[PDB]
Design a protein around this ligand. Structure first.
Ligand SMILES: Oc1cc(O)c2c(c1)O[C@H](c1ccc(O)c(O)c1)[C@H](O)C2
Length: 156
């Protein structure tokens, strides 16, 4: 089946600035997030269909995660990707998609609309553990990119 979850987060950063920064996430996330060590493009031009390999060290163990870029809509401040291999993908799941969309806040800040879609193989049940881990990932990225912009005011 498909399980869909929707969430919102807020930032004082205007959406156009945040979105520019999101485009540099491969560069930014290893600096801010302790566990991420590198992000490498296995193949692709960074657009839809690109495959990325993330190298992380978790619990003193090196591991890898695979991402695939689904779609990009700059006019709409959206970036979509799916987890398609690695530890992040549970055995039951076909695929886990994270959609990120940025909207102007009422006060000029930003609202991040985060949608998580969990595709399960057959009738398998989604792991609660993964979802909990899942909601954090959607947030952490956003915070990572936000923190970086706030800490480097002149750059964006
Ligand atoms: O705290 C974490 C832990 C993780 O395993 C990850 C986190 C944050 O965010 C990473 C991340 C997510 C999206 C990206 O585009 C990216 O470059 C890096 C990834 O989800 C894997």
């Amino acid at each position: 089946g498909v399980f869909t979850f929707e969430d919102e987060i807020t930032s004082t950063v205007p959406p156009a600035k945040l979105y520019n920064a999101m485009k540099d996430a491969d560069s930014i996330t290893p600096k801010i997030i302790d566990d991420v060590k590198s992000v490498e493009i296995v193949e692709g031009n960074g657009g839809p269909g690109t495959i990325k390999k993330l190298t992380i060290v978790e619990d003193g163990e090196t591991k890898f995660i695979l991402h695939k870029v689904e779609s990009i809509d700059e006019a709409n401040y959206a970036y979509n990707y799916s987890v398609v291999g690695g530890v992040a993908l549970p055995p039951t799941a076909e695929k886990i998609t994270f959609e990120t969309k940025l909207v102007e806040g009422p006060n000029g800040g930003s609202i991040g609309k985060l949608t998580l879609k969990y595709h399960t193989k057959g009738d398998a049940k989604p792991d609660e553990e993964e979802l909990k881990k899942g909601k954090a990932k959607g947030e952490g990225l956003f915070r990572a990119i936000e923190g970086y912009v706030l800490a480097n005011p002149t750059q964006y």
